[PDB]
Amino acid sequence: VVKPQGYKPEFVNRVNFGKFWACPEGTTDWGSEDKQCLVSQYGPMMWRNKWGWSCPAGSAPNNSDDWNQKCVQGYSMKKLIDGQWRCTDTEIDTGKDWSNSDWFTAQQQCDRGNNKVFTRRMYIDGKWQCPDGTWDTGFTWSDGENGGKQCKY
Amino acid sequence: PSYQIRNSKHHTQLPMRSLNEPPPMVEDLVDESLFEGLQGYPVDEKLDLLTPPGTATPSSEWAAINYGLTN
Amino acid sequence: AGGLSQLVAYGAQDVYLTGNPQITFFKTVYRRYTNFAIESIQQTINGSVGFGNKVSTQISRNGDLITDIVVEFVLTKGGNGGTTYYPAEELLQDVELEIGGQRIDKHYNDWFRTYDALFRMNDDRYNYRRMTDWVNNELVGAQKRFYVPLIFFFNQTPGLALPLIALQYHEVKLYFTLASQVQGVNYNGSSAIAGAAQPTMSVWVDYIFLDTQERTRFAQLPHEYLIEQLQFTGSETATPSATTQASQNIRLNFNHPTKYLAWNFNNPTNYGQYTALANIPGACSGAGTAAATVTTPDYGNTGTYNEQLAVLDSAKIQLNGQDRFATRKGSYFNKVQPYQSIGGVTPAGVYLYSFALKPAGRQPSGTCNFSRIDNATLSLTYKTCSIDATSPAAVLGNTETVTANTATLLTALNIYAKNYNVLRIMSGMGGLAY
Amino acid sequence: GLSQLVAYGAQDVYLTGNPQITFFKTVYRRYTNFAIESIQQTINGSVGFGNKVSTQISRNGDLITDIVVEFVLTKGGNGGTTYYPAEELLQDVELEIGGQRIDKHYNDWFRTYDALFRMNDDRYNYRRMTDWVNNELVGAQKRFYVPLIFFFNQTPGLALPLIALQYHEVKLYFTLASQVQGVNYNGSSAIAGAAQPTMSVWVDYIFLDTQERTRFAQLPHEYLIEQLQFTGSETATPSATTQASQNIRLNFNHPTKYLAWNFNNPTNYGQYTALANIPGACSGAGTAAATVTTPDYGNTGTYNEQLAVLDSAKIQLNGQDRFATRKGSYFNKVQPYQSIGGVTPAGVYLYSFALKPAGRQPSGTCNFSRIDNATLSLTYKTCSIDATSPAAVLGNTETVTANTATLLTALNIYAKNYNVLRIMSGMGGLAYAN
Amino acid sequence: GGLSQLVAYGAQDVYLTGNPQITFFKTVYRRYTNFAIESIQQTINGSVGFGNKVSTQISRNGDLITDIVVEFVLTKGGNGGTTYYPAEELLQDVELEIGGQRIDKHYNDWFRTYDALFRMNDDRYNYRRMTDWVNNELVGAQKRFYVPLIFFFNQTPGLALPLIALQYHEVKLYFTLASQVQGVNYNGSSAIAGAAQPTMSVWVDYIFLDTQERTRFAQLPHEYLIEQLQFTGSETATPSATTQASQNIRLNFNHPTKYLAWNFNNPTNYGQYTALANIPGACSGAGTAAATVTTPDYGNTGTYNEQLAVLDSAKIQLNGQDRFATRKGSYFNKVQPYQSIGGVTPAGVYLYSFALKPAGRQPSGTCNFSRIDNATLSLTYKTCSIDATSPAAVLGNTETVTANTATLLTALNIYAKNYNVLRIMSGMGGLAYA
Amino acid sequence: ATVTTPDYGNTGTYNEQLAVLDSAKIQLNGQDRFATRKGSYFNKVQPY
Amino acid sequence: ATSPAAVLGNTETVTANTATLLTALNIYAKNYNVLRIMSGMGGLAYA
Amino acid sequence: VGFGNKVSTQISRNGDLITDIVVEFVLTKGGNGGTTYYPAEELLQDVEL
């Protein structure tokens, strides 16, 4: 008899974007080192945190078993920016604020469609800076073939 | 750009050995600039399709023909 | 003296050719390959075979991989030599390719004719005709078995063989539509031929049998294949006339990284007629004599290279209204494009514009991703239909911007686009990426 | 359906990356330093019709490739009387290395080979080098060039390293036909005053520079080469009242690329089809003078399958069907379509065990050294058609042929296989005997 | 079935499938630099007309260039059969200049010789369709012709000319239009009253590179291994009725030469490389009462009938030493291209290759004439004793003789195709060797 | 009767011979979302 | 269209000559959005 | 296109931005001078964006 298999998540490797590394665009900046990028739509509630599983940084819990697929790829959180709990300009606020939703849908708020690794800067501090919740990648609108602006998850 | 972009490889009308017959390289198995009969992916041990450097899998070629390359 | 007198004369200019040599030519290394065998197996045809009927087959899981598919037909002649034109090709009106219940591709009799006209050549083209028509002056009542190869991506190369062994849960099917009428077989123009026989059909699939290590590999691993698909739409031709050069803005409703566009104008009445009829040898039924008519072709000689009888004066492709290339004459698409990109000869009335360096190859070589073009168009300018088709002096002695008065019969326009997609197989199932 | 699948929402965005190669800038490989020279060999024995002669290839260069046998003939009659006469003349050629037969070709093989594997203008140019193709008349004199087709005569990649064979000689033995049609005999009738042929054998030698020449001279070498296996047999001749059938043992060995065969009338070189009173199908065909017992020699070959004698065939291995029975037209038209891409004349058949039998690179073989019972099973057409009545021929059915088709009583079965020619310590021979 | 072949596995399979290296059932692809191709019209400086010299300059619209097609619009000055590749005849020559340096130059005769040797099958036919009238057009007919250029960058993407890297050098083309074109503005020596002047346009296919490739071209130095044509005209040692003339022609060539090519011709009639005769197609009106052997059937000027060729035999000497044994003209006409090209060369056109495959881009053996102080082509002509007006005299003649009209072939054209290096740096380009 | 003006009060009808759709399919992003079906599928079957 | 026999007895793939008058095409799509009301105000969450 | 008919067009995304739009019409006089008044303006009954 041959032993059955579970989710078996598919994870790619982070790439060199010039003086920094980041996860490729169809993927998310999941976990670290062994599992750096998620490819499939769900992944292994990575334990490393702060320590804590949420879920972690860029994915949110779903109502399932098989830890390997308990977080769904492509989300974040309200992430307070300046004085308002807005999603990043390139993110889509679902509307699931928290109070009007159950635990699973309350966490799945920003729908990071087409912006899983990089986003654009925001006119928040009056200076066009990297969103409060992300790392400040050195690229600009003049720089070609790199539409992402200061951002990384 | 930090990429070892090679020269072109077109279908030539003459077979050519790469002058490295004792170590059989894998980059010359898919190079159409030397062979002329047929083209196949290089099989590693236990009949595993080993993709040599420079070439790309069919899914990667589809991603490069639809979405685009990089810099 | 002799060859040595050349060999010894090594100079500075030779360093670029032979110094620090990388290769030789005098010993070929051949590449060891896996074991495989090819077996021709007949498939079951469901549904009734006959003119106008739709039949289909499900390709059995006999071998591990499949490639070449040939559909056999047995037809009889409903008239004498000169009445048919690639009738087996005409009969197979269309073929649909389905994997896992999903439509992968679809070819049409006209596509097969267009494809051949543009991409086959020399003795390949002749041998092809020998398998789809009567080419030895056969007479009425003659019986012949025809072999129509399919040209889906997997029917062209082993490199794209479909991994039936990897499709544990999915079937591969071919749906075949048989034409209601086939010229010179069951109909002479519009007239049915009393006593004409119904076709006999058989579908043959050439299967690849693999050894144990590779069969297992295919059965267990996911597989992705970069494949070709044919996009096609029929359009109404902005029919030209004696006093005018019609023009037409055709929306190119295509998607995907298109390798090339191809098109033709035709008289839908007569299969394969891409040009006007005329009273010049080979251009019409009875051409050259008293009995000549320019309402019916000499079917056996339907194809021609005489561009005078074609209707395209000029054309350009535009993307979102911007010119893709400068406007060129119809003869540019008919003669130069295929010269440059294919290397064969294209019949009048058949046109090509390639986006690819080598459109006939497997390897991508430049594409037009029409999925990114909101409004792609084809702009055609037609020739003036002023030539009296029944008078060779007018037909053979005329200019560039004109054609036959009978060219107004070419009211159909067929535009094709070949593009690249991905067929994925995983864990026993498969279908297309997009 | 409890297996794992992937949504692939952006699988391709994820799988992209940087360019690997650019199409617009070619790098040419630096090659070795060599030169090519055409050198005449000495032929021992008297050359003439029916004579056996031979030549030893002189050690003038290091490696050899192309070999051309020149013949000078004069027409013994007018245009229409000869058919590839220089091909006919070289009845056979045997290749001996170290005293061991490596290969051997026959005039009929050259005809079969050409008919099956050459094409387009190459085939025409070939004909120019072996026949009179511009309506030459009696007494016309021409030099013919018959290229040999041994493995080393087709590619430099298999150049024979005479330099590496210091203890072994390489020889060619050639049998000249006792009669050549339209040159010294018209059918069975000798042509008085016909001249004997002039013959010359040319070998194109490769001169290597020091580094490569030394490696060949000192190192052992293994060349993957192609050998012909052949034997003739009686045909189960069909007749007016019956479809003959025959179980033919295939006495072959080695990993065979393909089998090829033809039926013929041994009376007339190259006649693989029946004769008929239809244009080109017999001497005088189409006129009152037509005789369906003598071919139009200049037009001996044809693509009209109606005149062929094979209805269907299958090959069995170890007594079991290797593939489903297919019609003679499958072997004649489809196999070549799929495997060669040229056009094969009626009466000539192919069944490949290889993906690309026309090339050098192995692409699947049938190892007959591991097969206990290899049998070719043939079914012949009924010889009921009156060849003197074009209507009878041109309007016939799939299962019948000409009454004159019963004259095609000889069957020639050929096979090409891959062996290894090994050279070491100045000596060489085949890796395998069987 | 197929399994019965797979199981037949043993020792002789090891060298074919043991330790497999590649699988034929899986295609491997390469990520190529993204690019696009756009057709852009260049203008012409100077007045276009017969006998005029005009020129263009290729603008930097794209980054690299390849194909160039010169369009001409010509009328027929007579009926079908009066022209022969007239657009090819018209473009007397094209000179390629980069930075003011002459890089190369082609001649109308070269285009004809090149075609005669290197194009073939339907490539050749399609080519003819772009330069001539091949559908029996009549006087007054008008067509657009497309004459592709054959400079090294016009044959392959691999040599796309780097306009991008030539910041300070323009690429120009000088086109000389013949003062007379047969069947267009002249009929033999007579002018055709009312003949129209040609309309001309030069089209260049531009390659647009992506950012990364564009950058490399701008920053990196480049070198290309390219082809050049060397050419001089010589008088033929005209043979006669009573003698076999012979001639030693100095081969004033330099650089690594891929091959030599030559022909003999009648300067009056473009493309005439053979003698005229009263046999079908060999002269104006050949085969009938009106036949003349002073003027060709222009539409059938070319022929494969060697009996009308002038050359008996030839050899090439290097520094007074034989390079190869003397071979007959038929050896250069038929065998050389059999071996080296695979097409069919018309009578009167000869080839001698120093290369294994001269038809390709990759060098495969060259004769460097920069290291040969005195190369000579030694020609022996046939005796001009055959009365061309007597079909039998021609068709029944011998190897060493030809038509009395072969003495009209007073010109000898010798070409040499060689390899040089085009270097690009600091925005400028030019050749490495004189 | 005039086949240029409708019987306005009876404009609607179930007689499909007067309809113009032979067949249709919904294509998403360039590829068939379901196999092509006849106009009567969309008119009669879908709502059934 | 003026001949009942022509209409009533025809095939699946054909229609009336007067069917060419139906030149306008109306395409509708019914979808779901979210209407939110809060603090005395409201509107739709998505485009 | 005709009197009383409604026609329409979608602007392709050919350039990046759009400004001016000019509708061309070809009209003929059904009578002599003095019979028309800005007829191309009258003809374009309405335009909806």
Side-chain angles (χ1 to χ4, degrees), chain D residues 20-22 24 26 29 31 36 38 66 70 118 120-121 125 128 137 141 143 145 204 254 321-322 365 367 369 418, chain E residues 1 5 12-13 15 31 33 121 157-158 207 213 304 323 327 330-331 334 338-339 344-345 362 365 395 397 399:
Chain D
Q20 294 300 320
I21 185 166
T22 299
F24 301 91
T26 295
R29 298 287 193 172
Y31 65 96
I36 308 299
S38 184
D66 297 355
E70 296 182 358
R118 292 199 180 87
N120 304 330
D121 287 349
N125 192 61
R128 299 179 58 182
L137 302 174
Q141 185 182 51
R143 185 175 297 267
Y145 298 89
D204 291 349
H254 301 281
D321 297 349
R322 172 57 181 74
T365 62
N367 184 348
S369 299
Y418 297 89
Chain E
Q5 184 178 325
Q12 295 185 266
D13 293 301
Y15 60 87
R31 293 177 293 181
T33 299
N121 304 328
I207 298 161
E213 184 62 356
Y304 297 105
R323 174 58 181 75
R327 304 296 293 277
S330 63
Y331 176 88
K334 297 178 186 175
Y338 170 78
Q339 291 173 285
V344 62
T345 299
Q362 168 69 58
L395 292 172
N397 69 18
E399 183 176 52

XYZ file of all heavy atoms in Angstrom, chain D residues 20-22 24 26 29 31 36 38 66 70 118 120-121 125 128 137 141 143 145 204 254 321-322 365 367 369 418, chain E residues 1 5 12-13 15 31 33 121 157-158 207 213 304 323 327 330-331 334 338-339 344-345 362 365 395 397 399:
482
model
N 17.166 34.406 -22.015
C 18.279 33.477 -22.011
C 19.131 33.587 -23.260
O 20.332 33.306 -23.234
C 17.724 32.066 -21.908
C 17.043 31.797 -20.602
C 17.948 31.960 -19.420
O 19.144 31.579 -19.414
N 17.367 32.535 -18.375
N 18.487 33.950 -24.352
C 19.099 33.962 -25.669
C 18.500 35.008 -26.616
O 17.305 35.291 -26.552
C 18.957 32.543 -26.236
C 19.683 32.415 -27.583
C 17.497 32.188 -26.268
C 19.891 30.982 -28.061
N 19.325 35.575 -27.490
C 18.830 36.546 -28.472
C 18.939 36.032 -29.918
O 20.013 35.659 -30.373
C 19.567 37.909 -28.321
O 19.326 38.440 -27.001
C 19.049 38.911 -29.353
N 18.884 37.717 -32.835
C 19.456 38.626 -33.876
C 20.989 38.666 -33.984
O 21.479 39.426 -34.843
C 18.914 40.045 -33.683
C 17.413 40.166 -33.767
C 16.628 40.062 -32.630
C 16.785 40.384 -34.982
C 15.249 40.173 -32.707
C 15.405 40.495 -35.059
C 14.640 40.389 -33.922
N 24.147 35.997 -34.216
C 24.654 34.629 -34.284
C 26.098 34.497 -33.968
O 26.930 35.332 -34.335
C 24.367 33.964 -35.656
O 22.988 33.838 -35.814
C 24.972 32.573 -35.777
N 30.406 28.752 -34.971
C 31.386 27.943 -34.312
C 32.659 27.928 -35.114
O 32.636 27.807 -36.337
C 30.881 26.534 -34.147
C 29.634 26.351 -33.285
C 29.945 26.534 -31.868
N 28.882 26.079 -30.993
C 29.000 26.010 -29.655
N 30.130 26.393 -29.079
N 27.997 25.562 -28.900
N 35.603 25.993 -36.533
C 35.695 24.585 -36.899
C 37.123 24.153 -37.121
O 38.032 24.953 -36.972
C 34.801 24.340 -38.108
C 35.212 25.032 -39.326
C 35.950 24.388 -40.226
C 34.879 26.322 -39.524
C 36.383 24.999 -41.353
C 35.315 26.951 -40.637
C 36.065 26.296 -41.556
O 36.521 26.939 -42.675
N 38.913 19.739 -49.006
C 38.297 18.628 -49.751
C 38.866 18.479 -51.167
O 38.925 19.465 -51.896
C 36.773 18.839 -49.876
C 36.130 19.123 -48.468
C 36.123 17.588 -50.538
C 36.268 18.043 -47.438
N 38.811 16.042 -54.912
C 38.225 14.962 -55.692
C 39.320 14.224 -56.485
O 40.017 14.804 -57.343
C 37.161 15.500 -56.601
O 36.546 14.457 -57.261
N 31.930 11.472 -49.905
C 31.186 11.270 -51.122
C 31.934 10.419 -52.129
O 33.149 10.564 -52.302
C 30.878 12.604 -51.768
C 29.997 13.491 -50.911
O 29.546 13.084 -49.887
O 29.812 14.597 -51.301
N 31.179 7.467 -62.232
C 30.842 8.069 -63.492
C 30.699 6.997 -64.539
O 31.490 6.047 -64.581
C 31.922 9.035 -63.969
C 32.164 10.241 -63.108
C 33.240 11.177 -63.695
O 33.782 10.837 -64.729
O 33.527 12.212 -63.105
N 14.224 10.535 -51.958
C 14.691 11.795 -52.526
C 13.466 12.569 -52.883
O 12.360 12.043 -52.840
C 15.632 11.683 -53.715
C 17.000 11.103 -53.404
C 17.989 11.450 -54.479
N 19.306 10.920 -54.211
C 19.720 9.686 -54.553
N 18.910 8.858 -55.160
N 20.944 9.292 -54.292
N 11.669 16.454 -54.761
C 11.647 17.768 -55.329
C 12.747 17.927 -56.383
O 12.953 17.017 -57.200
C 11.857 18.713 -54.180
C 10.874 18.535 -53.123
O 9.757 18.141 -53.408
N 11.237 18.808 -51.893
N 13.508 19.027 -56.318
C 14.579 19.255 -57.266
C 15.766 18.344 -57.055
O 16.588 18.205 -57.957
C 15.062 20.693 -57.253
C 14.077 21.710 -57.897
O 13.123 21.333 -58.527
O 14.352 22.897 -57.784
N 17.400 16.530 -60.089
C 18.813 16.632 -60.398
C 19.436 15.247 -60.424
O 20.334 14.971 -61.224
C 19.511 17.519 -59.407
C 20.885 17.892 -59.815
O 21.115 18.534 -60.863
N 21.805 17.510 -58.997
N 18.780 13.772 -63.645
C 19.625 14.404 -64.690
C 20.972 13.678 -64.713
O 21.500 13.444 -65.818
C 19.821 15.889 -64.372
C 18.529 16.691 -64.321
C 18.773 18.148 -63.977
N 19.665 18.798 -64.927
C 20.074 20.057 -64.836
N 19.669 20.813 -63.829
N 20.886 20.558 -65.749
N 18.092 12.014 -78.445
C 17.881 10.992 -79.474
C 18.973 9.952 -79.588
O 20.041 10.076 -78.990
C 17.674 11.655 -80.820
C 16.507 12.630 -80.906
C 16.566 13.290 -82.245
C 15.169 11.910 -80.706
N 25.260 11.105 -76.438
C 26.213 10.647 -75.437
C 26.231 11.512 -74.211
O 26.305 12.735 -74.311
C 27.608 10.650 -76.010
C 28.673 10.093 -75.127
C 29.965 10.218 -75.800
O 30.275 11.339 -76.258
N 30.730 9.135 -75.905
N 27.626 11.767 -69.877
C 28.281 11.258 -68.699
C 27.302 11.316 -67.563
O 26.697 12.352 -67.276
C 29.530 12.022 -68.385
C 30.374 11.501 -67.218
C 31.598 12.301 -67.151
N 32.387 12.126 -68.382
C 33.387 11.235 -68.610
N 33.857 10.435 -67.658
N 33.909 11.180 -69.831
N 26.471 10.467 -63.493
C 27.115 10.443 -62.212
C 26.246 9.730 -61.209
O 25.225 10.261 -60.790
C 27.347 11.872 -61.767
C 28.234 12.676 -62.663
C 27.693 13.365 -63.714
C 29.572 12.756 -62.422
C 28.495 14.126 -64.508
C 30.371 13.522 -63.214
C 29.843 14.202 -64.246
O 30.655 14.972 -65.026
N 35.773 11.675 -52.865
C 36.094 12.975 -52.330
C 36.699 12.825 -50.945
O 36.091 12.285 -50.009
C 34.896 13.912 -52.404
C 34.567 14.282 -53.923
O 35.393 13.978 -54.781
O 33.538 14.866 -54.205
N 19.414 -7.128 -36.479
C 19.831 -5.782 -36.101
C 18.644 -4.821 -35.856
O 17.523 -5.091 -36.310
C 20.748 -5.233 -37.226
C 21.974 -6.049 -37.485
N 23.070 -5.975 -36.696
C 22.267 -6.964 -38.440
C 23.989 -6.794 -37.136
N 23.539 -7.413 -38.187
N 0.432 -9.531 -34.910
C 0.306 -8.283 -35.626
C 1.009 -7.148 -34.886
O 0.701 -6.903 -33.717
C -1.179 -7.942 -35.727
C -2.005 -8.977 -36.551
O -1.447 -9.838 -37.212
O -3.210 -8.957 -36.449
N 1.901 -6.431 -35.594
C 2.631 -5.274 -35.079
C 1.788 -4.022 -35.156
O 2.015 -3.066 -34.415
C 3.944 -5.110 -35.819
C 4.755 -3.875 -35.560
C 5.153 -3.616 -34.151
N 5.883 -2.392 -34.121
C 5.334 -1.194 -34.243
N 4.041 -1.024 -34.371
N 6.108 -0.147 -34.265
N 13.840 1.964 -33.326
C 14.184 0.848 -34.177
C 13.504 -0.425 -33.738
O 13.106 -0.562 -32.578
C 15.683 0.602 -34.169
O 16.093 0.274 -32.836
C 16.443 1.797 -34.651
N 14.392 -4.267 -33.288
C 15.543 -5.146 -33.221
C 15.201 -6.547 -33.611
O 14.703 -7.331 -32.811
C 16.154 -5.082 -31.855
C 17.381 -5.862 -31.730
O 17.755 -6.674 -32.594
N 18.044 -5.673 -30.625
N 17.075 -8.925 -34.130
C 17.989 -9.922 -33.618
C 17.360 -10.491 -32.363
O 17.858 -11.445 -31.765
C 19.326 -9.322 -33.245
O 19.980 -8.736 -34.337
N 20.815 -0.007 -37.988
C 21.967 0.709 -37.381
C 22.921 -0.285 -36.709
O 22.490 -1.074 -35.843
C 21.473 1.759 -36.382
C 20.643 2.864 -36.985
C 19.269 2.741 -37.108
C 21.230 4.034 -37.437
C 18.500 3.751 -37.661
C 20.476 5.053 -37.992
C 19.105 4.913 -38.106
O 18.355 5.914 -38.652
N 1.263 -5.782 -31.167
C 1.262 -4.334 -31.278
C 2.635 -3.744 -31.004
O 3.644 -4.447 -31.008
N 7.542 -4.606 -30.128
C 8.780 -4.041 -30.587
C 9.583 -3.662 -29.359
O 10.771 -3.933 -29.293
C 8.546 -2.844 -31.488
C 9.807 -2.247 -32.086
C 9.498 -1.084 -33.006
O 8.464 -1.118 -33.681
N 10.375 -0.076 -33.042
N 22.179 -4.965 -28.893
C 22.331 -4.016 -29.979
C 21.529 -2.753 -29.801
O 21.571 -1.862 -30.636
C 21.961 -4.641 -31.298
C 22.854 -5.710 -31.679
C 22.554 -6.226 -33.006
O 21.819 -7.205 -33.200
N 23.119 -5.533 -33.969
N 20.787 -2.678 -28.726
C 20.006 -1.517 -28.423
C 20.799 -0.615 -27.527
O 20.456 0.548 -27.341
C 18.697 -1.905 -27.769
C 17.824 -2.648 -28.716
O 17.491 -2.103 -29.742
O 17.514 -3.795 -28.453
N 23.658 0.870 -27.766
C 24.213 2.054 -28.390
C 23.156 3.010 -28.948
O 23.503 4.060 -29.488
C 25.221 1.654 -29.473
C 24.684 0.805 -30.615
C 24.113 1.386 -31.713
C 24.788 -0.554 -30.561
C 23.648 0.602 -32.759
C 24.322 -1.316 -31.604
C 23.762 -0.755 -32.687
O 23.312 -1.575 -33.709
N 13.906 30.922 -23.678
C 13.323 32.243 -23.547
C 14.097 33.271 -24.338
O 15.213 33.682 -23.963
C 13.218 32.643 -22.091
C 12.228 31.787 -21.315
C 12.133 32.100 -19.869
N 13.346 31.789 -19.147
C 13.516 31.962 -17.822
N 12.540 32.424 -17.085
N 14.664 31.655 -17.251
N 14.718 36.900 -26.222
C 14.583 38.323 -26.092
C 13.384 38.772 -26.866
O 13.234 38.420 -28.033
C 15.853 38.973 -26.640
O 16.966 38.514 -25.858
C 15.775 40.459 -26.622
N 12.964 24.321 -55.794
C 11.625 23.844 -55.621
C 10.627 25.001 -55.663
O 10.729 25.864 -56.544
C 11.605 23.161 -54.294
C 12.592 22.115 -54.211
O 12.880 21.497 -55.221
N 13.142 21.876 -53.052
N 18.185 36.404 -39.552
C 18.083 37.187 -38.334
C 19.414 37.269 -37.615
O 19.795 38.317 -37.095
C 17.065 36.380 -37.528
C 16.197 35.734 -38.575
C 17.125 35.381 -39.692
N 20.198 36.204 -37.727
C 21.485 36.102 -37.079
C 22.479 37.193 -37.424
O 23.432 37.435 -36.670
N 13.804 45.492 -36.974
C 13.684 44.785 -35.723
C 13.808 45.734 -34.566
O 14.785 46.486 -34.445
C 14.786 43.755 -35.615
C 14.637 42.754 -36.721
C 14.755 43.068 -34.217
C 15.840 41.999 -36.972
N 18.365 44.193 -24.505
C 19.120 43.895 -25.752
C 19.616 45.214 -26.361
O 20.783 45.264 -26.797
C 18.219 43.152 -26.740
C 18.935 42.728 -28.010
C 20.076 41.749 -27.797
O 20.379 41.443 -26.627
O 20.658 41.294 -28.802
N 17.702 22.919 -68.529
C 18.535 21.923 -67.885
C 19.225 21.040 -68.913
O 19.912 20.081 -68.549
C 17.684 21.079 -66.946
C 17.104 21.875 -65.842
C 15.777 22.198 -65.876
C 17.889 22.308 -64.810
C 15.237 22.952 -64.880
C 17.351 23.075 -63.820
C 16.031 23.392 -63.853
O 15.482 24.158 -62.866
N 44.335 21.889 -57.892
C 43.633 21.795 -56.620
C 42.830 20.509 -56.535
O 42.577 19.998 -55.447
C 42.771 23.018 -56.399
C 41.890 23.004 -55.222
C 42.568 22.819 -53.926
N 41.582 22.809 -52.927
C 40.750 21.798 -52.678
N 40.790 20.669 -53.344
N 39.848 21.951 -51.750
N 37.617 17.873 -64.018
C 36.318 17.219 -64.112
C 35.541 17.860 -65.231
O 35.814 19.001 -65.603
C 35.511 17.313 -62.828
C 36.181 16.782 -61.589
C 36.469 15.300 -61.596
N 35.264 14.429 -61.570
C 34.611 14.098 -60.447
N 34.996 14.584 -59.290
N 33.583 13.276 -60.513
N 29.791 19.015 -66.732
C 28.619 18.394 -66.155
C 28.804 18.056 -64.672
O 27.824 17.982 -63.931
C 28.251 17.187 -66.986
O 29.256 16.208 -66.964
N 30.064 17.860 -64.260
C 30.418 17.611 -62.834
C 30.132 18.868 -61.998
O 29.525 18.747 -60.914
C 31.890 17.205 -62.721
C 32.387 17.018 -61.310
C 32.277 15.796 -60.668
C 32.968 18.064 -60.612
C 32.730 15.617 -59.372
C 33.426 17.903 -59.316
C 33.308 16.673 -58.693
O 33.758 16.506 -57.415
N 26.072 19.508 -62.332
C 25.129 18.631 -61.658
C 25.563 18.050 -60.316
O 24.740 17.929 -59.400
C 24.869 17.437 -62.552
C 24.230 17.731 -63.864
C 24.085 16.450 -64.658
C 23.584 16.710 -66.046
N 23.545 15.471 -66.852
N 24.523 18.820 -56.339
C 23.900 17.684 -55.662
C 24.476 17.531 -54.275
O 23.757 17.440 -53.277
C 24.135 16.379 -56.416
C 23.729 15.156 -55.651
C 22.404 14.772 -55.542
C 24.714 14.397 -55.058
C 22.075 13.633 -54.830
C 24.391 13.277 -54.350
C 23.084 12.882 -54.228
O 22.785 11.740 -53.491
N 25.795 17.505 -54.233
C 26.533 17.307 -53.011
C 26.418 18.450 -52.020
O 26.227 18.249 -50.816
C 28.023 17.225 -53.342
C 28.482 16.044 -54.084
C 29.951 16.198 -54.472
O 30.331 16.949 -55.379
N 30.785 15.507 -53.734
N 18.648 21.971 -58.125
C 19.012 21.609 -59.490
C 19.531 22.834 -60.237
O 18.835 23.840 -60.390
C 17.826 20.975 -60.246
C 16.644 21.922 -60.389
C 18.312 20.513 -61.575
N 20.741 22.728 -60.747
C 21.354 23.844 -61.437
C 21.166 23.741 -62.956
O 21.451 22.685 -63.528
C 22.848 23.916 -61.093
O 22.992 24.110 -59.692
C 23.535 25.050 -61.801
N 26.934 29.069 -41.649
C 28.038 28.582 -40.848
C 29.176 28.176 -41.760
O 28.960 27.347 -42.641
C 27.552 27.393 -39.996
C 28.622 26.541 -39.283
C 29.411 27.148 -38.123
O 28.890 27.611 -37.077
N 30.726 27.130 -38.325
N 34.556 25.255 -44.301
C 35.720 25.034 -45.136
C 35.801 26.126 -46.171
O 34.815 26.442 -46.833
N 19.977 17.034 -80.459
C 19.516 16.023 -79.552
C 20.325 14.742 -79.601
O 20.400 14.044 -78.594
C 18.043 15.769 -79.792
C 17.096 16.916 -79.420
C 15.706 16.571 -79.899
C 17.085 17.147 -77.893
N 23.671 14.591 -80.264
C 25.116 14.869 -80.272
C 25.931 14.157 -79.183
O 25.400 13.374 -78.386
C 25.367 16.366 -80.216
C 25.017 17.069 -78.903
O 24.862 16.459 -77.839
N 24.917 18.380 -78.984
N 29.317 14.054 -76.113
C 29.759 14.757 -74.913
C 30.645 15.980 -75.142
O 30.526 16.976 -74.428
C 30.501 13.802 -73.975
C 30.928 14.466 -72.678
C 31.580 13.576 -71.685
O 32.516 12.877 -72.009
O 31.141 13.612 -70.570
